[PDB]
Paper text:
They catalyze the O2-dependent breakdown of N-heteroaromatic quinolone-type substrates with concomitant carbon monoxide production. Atypical for oxygenases, these enzymes promote the activation of the triplet ground-state O2 molecule without the aid of metal centers or external organic co-factors. Kinetic measurements indicate that their reaction mechanism relies on a fast initial step, during which the substrates' 3-hydroxyl group is deprotonated by the His-Asp subset of the triad, thus promoting its activation for molecular oxygen attack (step 1), whilst the nucleophile is not essential.
Electron-rich Xe is quite easily detected by crystallographic methods and has been successfully used to visualize hydrophobic O2 binding sites in proteins. Occupancy refinement of Xe atoms gives values in the 40–60% range. Overall, experiments and simulations agree that the ABH-fold HOD dioxygenase features an O2 pocket (B-site) within the active site at a location that overlaps with the most hydrophobic portion of its aromatic substrate. Transient O2 storage at the xenon-validated B-site that we have identified overlapping with the hydrophobic portion of the N-heteroaromatic binding site represents a convenient solution to the problem of O2 localization, as one might envisage a mechanism of displacement that upon substrate binding transfers O2 from the B-site to the R-site that is only about 5 Å away, thus organizing both reactants for catalysis.
Numbering used by the authors: 1 to 275
Amino acid sequence: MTDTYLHETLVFDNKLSYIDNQRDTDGPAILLLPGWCHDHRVYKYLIQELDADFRVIVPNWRGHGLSPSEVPDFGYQEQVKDALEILDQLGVETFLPVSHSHGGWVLVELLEQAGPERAPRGIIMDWLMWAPKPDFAKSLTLLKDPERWREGTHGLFDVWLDGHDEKRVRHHLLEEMADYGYDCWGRSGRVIEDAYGRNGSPMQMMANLTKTRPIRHIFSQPTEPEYEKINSDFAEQHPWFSYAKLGGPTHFPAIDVPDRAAVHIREFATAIRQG
Ligand SMILES: [Xe]
C-alpha cells in the first residue's frame, strides 16, 4: 500500500498531504502531479512500477486527499508554488515532473518557474492538446453549475471510460473520487476554462516557454486519427516535442497501462542522469 509513504506538512497556510517514498538513490526525483479532484491514489500502480529505482513524490492539492475539504479559491499558479515548497522542504533539487490530464497546467508552469537546470524534461499524460470541442466545453459549464455539477462528472466518466468495463479505472472514478464535491469540481471548471482562455492551448503554452526542453505527450485517448495528426504536426515543428500513443483503453494510463507509462518515465530519467 502507498499509504506507507503518505505524509502531511504545512505549506504556507494549508496542511497538504503528499507521497514520498524517501528512496536513497541518484536523482532526478520523479514528481507525479495529479489532475483536479483526485489524489495520489490515481498513481498507486505507477508508484509500484517505479518505487525501487526512484525517489517518488506525489503532492496533493489544497482540499485534496483521503479527506477532501473546502478551501479558498486557487488555480494552477498556486499549485506550482505548493509543489515547489514541498520540494524545498524535502531538499529535492533536480526532478522530472509527470502530469495526468489538467495537471499539465501545473507541469508546464513548473518548467517555466523552476527552470531547465532543476526541471530539465517533462512527461504529460493524456492531456487534451486542442482547444475545447463542443462536448468538453459543455462538460466544463456543467461542472461550474451548482445544480448540474454531478451530471457534468457523469458525462466525463462516460468519455474517460470510452465504453470499457475497466475495473481499476471504474474503482478510481466511482470510489476514489466519490468524496469530492462542487467545491472541487466547480473550481476545476473555472480554472481549466480560464487556462484554455488565457493560454490558448497546452501546445501554445508549451511553445511559449522561455526555455524549451524535452517534453513527451503519452496518451491513450482520444483515439481518432485527427488527434494523432495534431501531435505529429507539433512534433514535426518542434524538436523538443515527442509523443507516444499507448493504446490503453481509458483516459487513465497511469492505472490501466502503468508498465507502459513507467518505461517512458524511465527513459526520460535515464536521459537526465546521462548529462
Ligand atoms: Xe475536467
